[PDB]
Design a protein around this ligand. Structure first.
Ligand code: NA
Length: 330
């Protein structure tokens, strides 16, 4: 089997992407944030504290003829941005882009933190990291990918995120029309439950490539590119008037600037992030200070190749017995 679903930016900045997901019988379609940096499929629901729901579409298990309470199971998750959610668990039928899993754990939120309530466009998350990070207690649950894997034509999914445009998540096949050149594969460590890999270096604009190992995760659920402070300083030094602002919480730059590209290495291959991808716009409405899309990972404890990096590539998440990542230009 295979599946193919379009993923759509939630706003004009590509802060996140939403993908429709069919849950239950008859289908309830919710727009989920597919997150390769977490392992829970959780949804706003009929159980969510009413004051914490503001425009989201909710999953109502009582209206699904295939929903079953996973008795005694609870979940609770905290993300890198300080957001959180928790609740109980149902099993149900879940379909993505025509690919169906029966008996998927669907984590029903009783509580969500303010950042979820305030984002009316995201109805929940669908985790695509390794199932070792799933938070369901006392019986850990599998991701949608892990449950689908054995049925797939190939044990892979691909992320093809758009810049200010829709893109695609495919399950079970490589679309050889969706990228240019060849795919370069690189080793993954699953030791922390993430799609963790080592980039071979970087360049700033038309500058020389610096060969240096940068361990990080491929995380579709993180907006920005978080790299070591040396790398990030080197990048922003090439933008007149850019500075790190403790008050704003990262590097800002004059909105009048033209940003340089940023290149990252994947083995001997190179993925170029155009400068425009690094502009996250005014820090507040009408400001002439703009927020940068490359930020320091210092204090986060891991480098994160989030959407700013991933949307410059066609990315293969290879879930074979020895997982690997693939990157192609597109
Ligand atoms: Na922000």
């Amino acid at each position: 089997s295979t599946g193919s679903a379009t993923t759509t930016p939630i706003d004009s900045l590509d802060d996140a992407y939403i993908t429709p997901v069919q849950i239950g019988t008859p289908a309830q379609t919710l727009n989920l944030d597919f997150d390769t940096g977490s392992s829970d499929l959780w949804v706003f629901s009929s159980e969510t504290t009413a004051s914490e729901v503001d425009g989201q579409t909710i999953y109502t298990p009582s209206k699904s003829t295939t929903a079953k309470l996973l008795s005694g199971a609870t979940w609770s998750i905290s993300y890198g941005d300080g957001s959180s959610s928790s609740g109980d668990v149902y099993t149900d039928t879940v379909s993505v882009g025509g690919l169906t899993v029966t008996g998927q754990a669907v984590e029903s939120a009783k509580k969500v933190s303010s950042s979820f309530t305030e984002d009316s466009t995201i109805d929940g998350l669908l985790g695509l990291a390794f199932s070792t990070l799933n938070t369901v207690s006392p019986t850990q649950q599998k991701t949608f990918f892990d449950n689908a894997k054995a049925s797939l034509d190939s044990p892979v999914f691909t992320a093809d995120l758009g810049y200010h445009a829709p893109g695609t998540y495919n399950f079970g096949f490589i679309d050889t029309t969706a990228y240019t050149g060849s795919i370069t594969y690189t080793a993954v460590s699953t030791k922390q439950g993430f799609w963790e890999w080592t980039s071979t270096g970087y360049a700033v604009g038309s500058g020389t490539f610096k060969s240096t190992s940068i361990d990080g995760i491929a995380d579709t659920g993180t907006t920005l590119l978080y790299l070591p402070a040396t790398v990030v300083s080197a990048y922003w030094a090439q933008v007149s008037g850019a500075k790190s602002s403790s008050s704003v919480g990262g590097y800002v730059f004059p909105c009048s600037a033209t940003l340089p590209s940023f290149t990252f290495g994947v083995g001997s291959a190179r993925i170029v992030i155009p400068g425009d991808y690094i502009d996250f716009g005014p820090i507040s409405t009408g400001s002439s200070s703009c927020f940068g899309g490359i930020q320091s990972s210092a204090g986060i404890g891991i480098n994160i190749f989030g959407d700013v990096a991933l949307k410059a590539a066609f990315v293969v998440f290879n879930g074979a017995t020895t997982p690997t990542l693939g990157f192609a230009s597109k």
